[PDB]
């Protein structure tokens, strides 16, 4: 049973250590979701600060990888920050060597290749994280690319990750079946954020205060996260209609 | 399995303890330190009568003032002897003098705990290192694969050792002559050896300040065996 | 420091290399892919089995250009395939193009990929690749060709074949229909027919990935004025081009 | 060192090599043998920088003797000369190149033919009816060009060589203290002991 | 171009008597035509009844004396506090000096 | 680099990989060496499960290390090549630096040292080989015969045998070899050697190889016929 | 038990068994005592012979003029660690013209031992050490365990039966700490403390090892006839 | 099973048991805490007096990094020293390239990445310490706590070791009773009390209190040990509250 | 640490055998049979491909017979990918030798090198051995026509006729029955195909399941020619020797 401890094949052609790394990915009990506007890419994630001794401003699973790229992580924070540091190093190096900003999809591929290596080389363990990369790419426009512990990645019209990803996913699928377009047809990112929060509320059947969420927005030439107060203003607009 | 450098629950290194077991299976070697010299004797233990027993080399010169006898996995001793010779000669090159017997012994013992996962296992041989220097006179040390070395007035190692050591406990005193030490080594070897002791299956050697390290001829040892036989028959 | 300097694939008492057998089992579970060789071309094809409908599956390319005249498809572990495609593209340059000033012939690029796969089967501290590849290509002196590469590093040339899930059925289907007079359009038609059998759901241009090695495409070169440079022979068919051929089905 | 000559006649190869060893101001020795037997039917003479000559020659000798034992077989003169050439060609792009020029005289027992190879320190190899290194060729080649025949006997080879050495002793400014002469043929290698 | 050497002047003198020895040196340290110090000791007690001076380039001289003193310390550690005899000290210093054969200590040493 | 301690001590003070190396030696074809008064003979058993073998080219069992020394072995054939190559390289290196060919004892000590090193280096297994090394020291006429084994111990022998059924042929040599009178000719020595192998061999056919080594690099392998005359004469004195 | 195969494995209760086993080797070692006043620091060590023909194994090692130690456990490990200390004392003198603070020596030993407790292939050191010295802040005594824990003390003991000596020193604390300017009295309290750990045998002239360092006293070791005075 | 025999192995429930066992060594250690005040941080730790023979004040536990950061830990003391040695190298190399002393959040991640690295391989063992650390940088005071998994967050107050539960509840009261904040001087007094309170779970032995602080106003943003009079006054204030 | 997962590929069993070598030999016994036969005027190599398909491109396919240089070829039994690693190494050694000595490498020197490489994987490095046995057919001007085999132990031996792969016991008995020293290449061709015909696990022996090669001094005057038979040429020699 040592084929269970390291990344070698089981007799059914499976990699158990990879499968168990996916299981670690839900250990924070956080759900996240990402959607695309006409001009922007929005990512939201639940925020849970279960201890009063914590400084809540330091509790985050959203990362500013470069000027243009944001990353939300589903998984434990040590592995999340390992991935974040590496992604930051890769994006900076890419710009130095090739003279232009690393695209969201290329960074996702690169991080996915690194992950592939941990599934084939025995001395390295997979990271127990799923990485959702967002930007407004200069060639491809609003972009969502997500990586997992198998070294798989793909681009998304929208996506969700966490213990309740299925509910959010089906909710999002239902909306897009209706609208028949690959994105939220909204001018302003404020409204795309409101859409994103609204559909998370429907899908999880729970309400949010301003401290229950984390929001990241990508626009042309920048990614930024919202303060509790920008989020409050979002929540207020949702309630008043 | 388990690491080659693992401690047991009693705080002993498994591999060192096990090499000590291999040493217990070795042919016997004995040394006796006197104020006139140190004697070193060994059981040769040829495995067949067709084996030419003067090709059995278990006593070995390290330098003019230092000799060495071994017991255990004797092939393991060759790199230890090579190191000891290099260290003695190197010290003389650097300092224009003889190296101390203890310093030489310590240098050999520094090799011993250099195993891991450096060599892959401890040495499976124990050494009796005998010699003379100006500061501490005639000296005999016992060098183990644990890297410990003890100084001794007399000592036996190998398969006959705790019978031989009991004997040495009784017979050693601070006034032994060289001649008396030689007979004693011969007598205790005779005692613990399977075969009948003679000049072709045991070997003697000494180190004196004057003549340095010497391995005895078979003819010379034959005479001492004869002389032993007669003194025993005389009470 | 990688301290796994020993093989993770070894011979069992029965002579089996377990990890290779298990890699082959992972390939067996994989989505079906196939290739057919015509007189004037080769076609490779597979199903784009999308993992969620929110996934944009045109961003996941199962059929890959290796050189302008060589393409590849796989069955098994997608991430293993993706890294092999990166290495294969590179080795085509480093161990051939930077030496001879031309792209490698299909069989030698296959040889290089195969060697990489063999080494993952014997080198210290790694597992075999969990993929089988089908590699189609053209070169001047060998013409059109199609190869399969397996997790062991073994490769074989085929007239037509299939790998993954429905391969036993697909191979029997292909044996009936293959002859040495097929024209590329015939082989495409047969590929589409064969592939329909192993596909459950949707079957259209957006769920099928199909590429050909055929005529030189001067329109895809990107420049004019060098007579001897006539364009890549590898071409991926569009969603629309596949659907046009699905009415003719 | 200084003069090394070789001539390949009908059935043998003759190598002639000077005896002097000069450390600047004094002739330290007048009986130096500038040659090594590489195998029973192959001889190599050498000249060039002090120390490097003998080091290179003994290194080559050790290698050919190793090959001979490993395979229980004597390499052909052509094979030995190719091995030597490669060593010098590799050496010329070294940190410190061997500054050594050689002649290889061998009798090929398979073809039953004497062979003479001339190789300089760059790894420049040529097979010749006669050859030399240094200035020796400048004084001797006009004589060899005149008298040489491919069907000469060994004794005619030695007589033509005597004439070459006489011209060297006449016109060359340095006293090279005569030559040691060795013959390589089907029976092996021997030294002519009065010359 | 950087010149790693200098000349600090100084003159030293050792004489062996029947049952004594003296090592003497002037205490002036100079560069070129300037005096750096009128009292910079240049003869040193090294332990074990050995005195030493390494005259010439003072940086190298100081480095050598310092290394020899250290070698005396380690001789005691390694050889049961045995006294380093003068002949043994001398051979030891040869090895300290020859270790820098191709980048020498620019000094004339006397013990 | 692969570093694993494969040769390690067991609780009873045994190194099993070395002991198992000896088991590989026991399985190998029998080899014997006998010294005469002015020669040494090496005899080797050839297992006769192999006809259609081409004997011109098939690796021979006795190997010249230099022109004056030979080596034979029992155990893993592939392993023996590694030791033979190293020994040949060392013989040339000794000639190059000392300006004298190796003594038989020096060469034995070298091979034995290589074998020992492979019993306490990480990542390697011991050689499954024991050797008989025989010849004459340069400018010496006293015959030499040594034995090495996987542990790296070595020693000198008046006569000795290794490999399968060597218990039996040692039995024979111990009762038939008189030290006070070694086989005083090539003939006597070769006859005593063929007799020792006949205890164990089967057909005295091409099952038995014999190599004679005399002083001054005089080394020759006997042929099937010449051995056959020994086999012949041996059984004709038997029926008696 | 399943967790004691190497130093890189915690047990389910958070223990490191290879380290605990290393600690066990010290417990089998011969007793050694350390104690200090405000002017001096003293080591006393009971040396062990192998038998009547054998020497008594030395327990005390000088590290510098102002520092040294005594060992209990694997002696070759003490040699490795004391050699390291010699080098570090030496480095401080040569580079900074500064005698290495005893406290700093303790920190360096801790860190050296720690590395052998957190990596594959290593083993912990199997020796305990008592380090005395006199530096710019006076007399000091340190106890080192191969877990890497180093502690500053007025007095202590390690080795077999060290508990007796240790209790004695605990009662005497208020007396011996005041033995300033009298080396011989401090040593007596040391020999008395170590006596609380003897059974069967007593302190003989080849048995006893004493070392002292202080105000105007280089670290010096007394063996043989030089300890008869205290027997 | 056998999933807990080797570091970096995921169990079937996605856990790294060797890290969880490291946490047991931490829970077994003495109590250590930190309190973030108005313009600084305070660190304090319980030091068990195993014997009379321990020289008082002399086995210092709190460690400075650079000049502006304090670190304290519970668990295996040598592991904590190893982590601080690494932190000192990271701080030096940051200051060398960037000139400015390392900011506290930047320093937190340096320790975090290093501790996390020791959960990636089976050839190393996780750290058997939880570390409370922080100080003042250009954006104000920062307090952090870092676990054997590499996990860290910023805190208002923090505690670890055997008396962690007691200290936490005490720390929570302070957070509730002072939304505006605590002065550095108040924080020192409070820290002394909380260690005294938490010492119940360790009552067998007596202990020695050790406190340090970095405060913009009180220490000029440098890390200093609380000594002499100010220490005594905090010991007294603590004695009172446990009486 | 990592020791836990180490198979220890280079250890003796208690009987003094090499586990991985033995198990590699077991693997090789399921490979298609290959046969070499040495005549006075050349050498034959014949080998059977493993269970084929009608869609396999035979005329561009090679799985058993490989050229090492113009004078030396090999037949492979075992893991094909492993074989190609070793084959490329042997091709390089041959060119190194030619460059160094300006003479073609003698057959045995090549064979010994490849065998030493295999031997190394059984003694050090902790890697699995190559799952390959070779038959070497070649010519040099010292020994003339030569046949060797090597196996995963790195042991090699010379033969007049030999088989490797599946059913070697049966094959070897059949070769031993009909082989004669004065036999010629055309006779050897027939013996090789007859032997494969009888030992095959297939229903019949057809051209599409064979690879075939001869090394003849049937190259004009003192020189040697290698001929790797095309599918049509294998088909003709099956008819001509009357097997189809």
């Amino acid at each position: 049973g040592y084929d269970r401890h390291i990344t070698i094949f089981s007799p059914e052609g499976r990699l158990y250590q990879v499968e168990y790394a996916f299981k670690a990915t839900n250990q924070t009990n956080i759900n996240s979701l990402a959607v695309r506007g006409k001009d922007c890419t929005v990512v939201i994630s639940q925020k849970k600060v279960p201890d009063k001794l914590l400084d809540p401003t330091t509790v985050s699973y959203i990362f500013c990888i470069s000027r243009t790229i944001g990353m939300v992580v589903n998984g434990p924070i040590p592995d999340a920050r390992n991935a974040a540091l590496r992604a930051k190093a890769e994006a900076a190096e890419f710009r130095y060597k090739y003279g232009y900003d690393m695209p969201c999809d290329v960074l996702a591929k690169r991080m996915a290749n690194l992950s592939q290596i941990y599934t084939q080389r025995a001395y390295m363990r997979p990271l127990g994280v799923i990485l959702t990369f967002v930007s407004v790419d200069e060639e491809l426009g609003p972009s969502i690319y997500k990586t997992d512990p198998a070294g798989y990645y793909v681009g998304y019209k929208a996506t969700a990750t966490g213990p309740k990803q299925q509910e959010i996913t089906t909710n999002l699928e239902n909306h897009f079946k209706k609208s028949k377009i690959d994105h939220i047809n909204e001018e302003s990112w404020e409204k795309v954020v409101e859409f994103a929060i609204t559909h998370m509320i429907d899908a999880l059947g729970t309400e949010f205060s301003k401290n229950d969420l984390e929001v990241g927005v990508a626009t042309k030439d920048k990614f930024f996260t919202l303060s509790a107060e920008n989020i409050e203003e979002r929540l207020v607009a949702i309630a008043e209609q | 399995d388990r690491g080659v450098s693992t401690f047991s629950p009693e705080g002993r290194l498994f591999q060192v303890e096990y090499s000590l077991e291999a040493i217990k299976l070795g042919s016997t070697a004995i040394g006796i330190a006197t104020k006139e010299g140190v004697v070193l004797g060994v059981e040769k233990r040829a495995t067949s009568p067709l084996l030419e027993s003067d090709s059995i080399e278990k006593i070995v010169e390290i330098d003019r003032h230092i000799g060495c006898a071994m017991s255990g996995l004797t092939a393991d001793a060759r790199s230890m002897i090579e190191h000891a010779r290099t260290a003695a000669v190197t010290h003389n090159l650097y300092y224009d003098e003889d190296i101390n017997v203890e310093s030489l012994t310590q240098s050999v013992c520094d090799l011993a705990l250099r195993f891991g996962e450096l060599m892959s296992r401890p040495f499976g041989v124990a050494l009796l290192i005998a010699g003379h220097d100006a500061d501490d006179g005639y000296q005999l040390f016992h060098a183990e694969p644990s890297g410990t070395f003890y100084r001794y007035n007399a000592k036996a190692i190998g398969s006959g050792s705790e019978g031989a050591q009991a004997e040495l406990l009784n017979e050693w005193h601070s006034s032994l002559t060289l001649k008396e030490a030689e007979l004693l080594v011969l007598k205790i070897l005779k005692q613990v050896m399977e075969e009948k002791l003679d000049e072709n299956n045991a070997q003697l050697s000494c180190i004196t300040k004057q003549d340095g390290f010497k391995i005895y001829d078979n003819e010379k040892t034959a005479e001492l065996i004869k002389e032993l036989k007669e003194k025993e028959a005389a009470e | 420091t990688d301290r796994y300097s020993f093989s993770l694939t070894t011979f069992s008492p029965s002579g089996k290399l377990g990890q290779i057998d298990y890699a082959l089992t992972a390939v067996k579970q994989g989505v079906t892919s196939l290739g057919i060789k015509a007189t004037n071309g080769v076609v490779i094809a597979t199903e784009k089995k999308s993992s969620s409908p929110l996934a944009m599956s045109e961003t996941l390319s199962k059929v890959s250009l290796l050189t302008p005249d060589i393409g590849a498809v796989y069955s098994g572990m997608g991430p293993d395939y993706r890294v092999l495609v990166d290495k294969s593209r590179k080795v085509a340059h480093t161990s051939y193009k930077r030496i001879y000033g031309e792209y490698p012939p299909t069989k030698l690029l296959v040889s290089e990929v195969a060697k990489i796969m063999q080494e993952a089967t014997q080198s210290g501290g790694v597992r075999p690749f969990g993929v089988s590849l089908l590699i189609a290509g053209h070169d001047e002196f060998n013409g059109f060709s199609l190869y399969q590469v397996d997790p062991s590093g073994s490769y074989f040339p085929w007239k037509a074949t299939a790998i993954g899930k429905g391969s036993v059925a697909a191979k029997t289907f292909l044996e009936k229909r293959w002859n040495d007079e097929l024209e590329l359009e015939d082989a495409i038609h047969i590929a589409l027919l064969t592939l329909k059998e192993s596909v459950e759901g949707e079957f259209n241009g957006d769920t099928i990935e199909l590429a050909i090695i055929g005529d030189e495409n001067p329109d895809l070169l990107g420049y004019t004025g060098i007579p001897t440079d006539k364009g890549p022979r590898f071409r991926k068919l569009t969603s629309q081009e596949i659907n046009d051929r699905l009415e003719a089905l | 060192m200084d003069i090394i000559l070789g001539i390949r006649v009908q059935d043998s190869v003759i190598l002639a090599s000077s005896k002097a060893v000069t450390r600047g101001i004094s002739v330290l020795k007048d009986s130096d043998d500038k040659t090594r037997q590489l195998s029973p039917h192959t001889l190599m003479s050498f000249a060039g920088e002090a120390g490097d000559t003998v080091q290179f020659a003994e290194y080559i000798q050790a290698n050919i003797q190793l090959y001979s034992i490993r395979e229980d077989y004597e390499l052909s003169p052509q094979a030995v000369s190719s091995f030597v050439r490669q060593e010098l060609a590799k050496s010329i792009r070294s940190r410190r190149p061997y500054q050594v020029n050689v002649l290889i005289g061998g009798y090929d027992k398979k073809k039953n033919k004497p062979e003479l190879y001339q190789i300089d320190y760059l790894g420049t190899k040529v097979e010749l009816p006669y050859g030399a290194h240094g200035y020796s060729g400048f004084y001797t080649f006009s004589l060899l060009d005149h008298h040489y025949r491919p069907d000469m006997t060994t004794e005619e080879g030695l007589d033509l060589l005597k004439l070459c050495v006489q011209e060297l002793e006449k016109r060359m400014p340095m006293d090279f203290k005569g030559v040691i002469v060795k013959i390589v043929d089907k029976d092996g290698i021997r030294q002519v002991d009065d010359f | 171009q950087f010149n790693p050497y200098g000349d600090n002047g100084g003159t030293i003198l050792g004489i062996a008597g029947e049952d004594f020895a003296v090592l003497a040196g002037d205490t002036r340290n100079i560069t070129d035509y300037s005096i750096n110090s009128r009292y910079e000791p240049k003869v040193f007690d090294c332990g074990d009844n050995i005195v030493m001076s390494a005259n010439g380039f003072a940086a190298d001289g100081d480095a050598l004396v310092k290394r020899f003193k250290n070698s005396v310390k380690w001789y005691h550690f390694d050889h049961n506090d045995k006294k380093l005899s003068i002949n043994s000290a001398a051979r030891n210093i040869q090895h300290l000096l020859y270790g820098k054969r191709f980048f020498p200590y620019y000094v004339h040493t006397i013990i | 680099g692969y570093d694993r301690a494969l040769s390690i001590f067991s609780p009873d003070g045994h190194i099993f990989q070395v002991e198992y190396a000896l088991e590989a030696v026991k399985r190998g074809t029998c080899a014997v060496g006998v010294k005469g008064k002015n020669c040494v003979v090496l005899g080797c058993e050839r297992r006769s499960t192999l006809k259609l073998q081409d004997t011109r080219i098939t690796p021979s069992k006795v190997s010249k290390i230099d022109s004056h020394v030979v080596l034979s072995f029992s155990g893993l054939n592939a392993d023996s090549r590694i030791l033979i190559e190293k020994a040949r390289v060392e013989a040339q290196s000794h000639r190059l630096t000392l300006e004298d060919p190796v003594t038989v004892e020096y060469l034995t000590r070298y091979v034995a040292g290589v074998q020992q090193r492979y019993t306490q280096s990480g990542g390697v297994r011991p050689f499954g080989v024991s050797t008989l090394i025989a010849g004459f020291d340069p400018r010496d006429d006293e015959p030499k015969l040594y034995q090495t084994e996987p542990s790296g111990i070595y020693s000198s022998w008046s006569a000795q045998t290794i490999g399968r059924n060597s218990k039996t042929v040692r039995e024979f040599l111990e009762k038939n070899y008189d030290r006070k009178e070694p086989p005083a000719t090539v003939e006597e020595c070769v006859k005593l050697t063929v007799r020792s192998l006949l205890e164990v061999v089967q057909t005295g056919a091409k099952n038995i190889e014999i190599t004679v080594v005399k002083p001054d690099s005089d080394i020759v392998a006997l042929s099937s016929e010449e051995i056959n005359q020994y086999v012949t004469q041996i059984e004709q004195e038997k029926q008696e | 038990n399943n967790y004691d195969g190497d130093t890189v494995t915690f047990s389910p209760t958070g223990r490191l068994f290879q380290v605990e086993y290393a600690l066990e080797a010290i417990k089998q070692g011969s007793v050694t005592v350390g104690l200090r006043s405000n002017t001096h620091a003293v080591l006393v060590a009971l040396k062990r012979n192998a038998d009547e023909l054998s020497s008594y194994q030395k327990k005390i090692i000088k590290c510098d003029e102002h520092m040294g130690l005594s060992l209990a456990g694997l002696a070759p490990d003490a040699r490795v660690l004391s050699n390291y200390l010699r080098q570090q004392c030496n480095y401080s003198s040569l580079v900074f013209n500064r005698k290495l603070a005893v406290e700093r020596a303790g920190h360096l030993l801790c860190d050296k031992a720690q590395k052998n407790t957190q990596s594959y292939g290593g083993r912990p050191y199997g020796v305990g050490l008592l380090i005395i010295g006199y530096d710019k802040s006076g007399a000091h005594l340190l106890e080192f365990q191969p877990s890497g824990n180093v502690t500053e003390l007025y007095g202590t003991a390690i080795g077999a039966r060290s508990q007796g000596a240790k209790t004695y020193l605990e009662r005497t604390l208020d007396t011996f700490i005041k033995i300033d300017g009298n080396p011989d009295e401090l040593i007596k309290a040391g020999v008395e403390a170590i006596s609380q750990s003897l059974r069967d045998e007593s302190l003989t002239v080849d048995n006893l090892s004493i070392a002292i360092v202080g105000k105007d006293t280089p670290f010096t070791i007394y063996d043989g006839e030089a300890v008869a005075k205290y027997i | 099973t056998g999933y807990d025999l080797s570091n970096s192995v995921f169990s079937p429930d996605g856990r790294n048991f060797q890290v969880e066992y490291a946490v047991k060594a931490v829970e077994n250690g003495t109590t250590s805490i930190g309190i973030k005040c108005n313009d600084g941080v305070v660190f304090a730790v319980e030091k068990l007096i195993t014997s009379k023979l321990l020289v008082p004040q002399k086995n210092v536990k709190i460690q400075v990094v650079d000049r502006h950061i304090g670190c304290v830990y519970s668990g295996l003391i040598p592991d904590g020293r190893h982590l601080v040695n690494r932190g000192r190298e990271e701080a030096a190399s940051f200051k060398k390239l960037y000139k400015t002393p390392i900011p506290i959040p930047a320093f937190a991640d340096r320790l975090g990445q290093y501790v996390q690295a020791h959960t990636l391989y089976n050839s190393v063992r996780p750290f058997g310490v939880s570390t409370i650390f922080g100080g003042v940088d250009k954006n104000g005071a920062h307090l952090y706590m870092l676990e054997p998994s590499g996990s860290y967050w910023g805190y208002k107050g923090a505690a670890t070791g055997k008396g962690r539960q007691s200290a936490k509840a005490e720390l929570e009261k302070l957070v509730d009773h002072h939304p505006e904040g605590l002065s550095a001087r108040e924080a020192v007094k409070q820290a002394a009390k909380i260690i005294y309170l938490a010492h119940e779970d360790n009552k067998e032995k007596d202990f020695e209190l050790e406190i340090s602080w970095c405060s913009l106003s009180e220490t000029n943003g440098l890390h200093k040990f609380v000594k002499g009079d100010l220490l005594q006054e905090a010991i007294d204030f603590a004695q009172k509250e446990i009486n | 640490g990592s020791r836990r997962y180490d198979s220890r590929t280079t250890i003796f069993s208690p009987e003094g055998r090499l586990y991985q070598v033995e198990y590699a030999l077991e693997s090789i016994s399921h490979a298609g049979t290959a046969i070499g036969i040495m005549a006075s005027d050349g050498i034959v190599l014949a080998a059977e491909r493993k269970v084929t398909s009608t869609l396999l491109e035979q005329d561009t396919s090679t799985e058993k017979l490989y050229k090492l240089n113009d004078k030396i070829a090999v037949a492979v039994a075992g893991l094909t990918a492993d074989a190609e690693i070793l084959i490329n190494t042997a091709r390089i050694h041959a060119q190194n030798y030619l460059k160094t000595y300006n003479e073609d490498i003698p057959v045995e020197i090549l064979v010994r090198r490849l065998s030493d490489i295999k031997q190394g994987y059984t003694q050090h490095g902790g890697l699995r051995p190559f799952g390959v046995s070779f038959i070497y057919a070649g010519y040099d001007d010292r020994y003339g026509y030569q046949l060797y085999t090597s196996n995963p132990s790195g042991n090699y031996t010379g033969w007049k006729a030999i088989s490797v792969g599946a059913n070697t016991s049966a094959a070897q008995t059949l070769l031993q029955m009909d082989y004669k020293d004065d036999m010629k290449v055309d006779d050897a061709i027939e013996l090789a195909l007859k032997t494969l015909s009888k030992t095959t696990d297939s229903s019949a022996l057809t051209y599409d399941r064979l690879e075939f090669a001869t090394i003849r001094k049937g190259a004009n005057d003192g020189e040697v020619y290698q001929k790797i038979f095309k599918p049509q040429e294998i088909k003709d020699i099956l008819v001509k020797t009357g097997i189809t």
Side-chain angles (χ1 to χ4, degrees), chain F residues 88-90:
Chain F
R88 285 169 166 168
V89 168
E90 174 62 22

PDB file of all heavy atoms in Angstrom, chain F residues 88-90:
ATOM      1  N   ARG F  88      43.946  -5.118 -14.965  1.00  0.00           N
ATOM      2  CA  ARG F  88      44.768  -4.854 -16.149  1.00  0.00           C
ATOM      3  C   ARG F  88      45.215  -3.392 -16.226  1.00  0.00           C
ATOM      4  O   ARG F  88      46.372  -3.111 -16.541  1.00  0.00           O
ATOM      5  CB  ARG F  88      44.008  -5.240 -17.419  1.00  0.00           C
ATOM      6  CG  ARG F  88      43.937  -6.741 -17.633  1.00  0.00           C
ATOM      7  CD  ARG F  88      42.961  -7.117 -18.733  1.00  0.00           C
ATOM      8  NE  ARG F  88      43.139  -8.505 -19.154  1.00  0.00           N
ATOM      9  CZ  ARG F  88      42.298  -9.180 -19.935  1.00  0.00           C
ATOM     10  NH1 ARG F  88      41.186  -8.612 -20.397  1.00  0.00           N
ATOM     11  NH2 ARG F  88      42.570 -10.441 -20.253  1.00  0.00           N
ATOM     12  N   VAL F  89      44.295  -2.474 -15.942  1.00  0.00           N
ATOM     13  CA  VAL F  89      44.616  -1.045 -15.888  1.00  0.00           C
ATOM     14  C   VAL F  89      45.678  -0.785 -14.820  1.00  0.00           C
ATOM     15  O   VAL F  89      46.652  -0.074 -15.068  1.00  0.00           O
ATOM     16  CB  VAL F  89      43.357  -0.186 -15.619  1.00  0.00           C
ATOM     17  CG1 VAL F  89      43.723   1.252 -15.262  1.00  0.00           C
ATOM     18  CG2 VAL F  89      42.439  -0.203 -16.832  1.00  0.00           C
ATOM     19  N   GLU F  90      45.491  -1.372 -13.639  1.00  0.00           N
ATOM     20  CA  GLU F  90      46.430  -1.194 -12.532  1.00  0.00           C
ATOM     21  C   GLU F  90      47.806  -1.793 -12.836  1.00  0.00           C
ATOM     22  O   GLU F  90      48.825  -1.248 -12.407  1.00  0.00           O
ATOM     23  CB  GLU F  90      45.859  -1.785 -11.235  1.00  0.00           C
ATOM     24  CG  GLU F  90      46.813  -1.774 -10.043  1.00  0.00           C
ATOM     25  CD  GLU F  90      47.234  -0.377  -9.614  1.00  0.00           C
ATOM     26  OE1 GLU F  90      46.517   0.598  -9.919  1.00  0.00           O
ATOM     27  OE2 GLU F  90      48.290  -0.252  -8.961  1.00  0.00           O
TER      28      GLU F  90
END
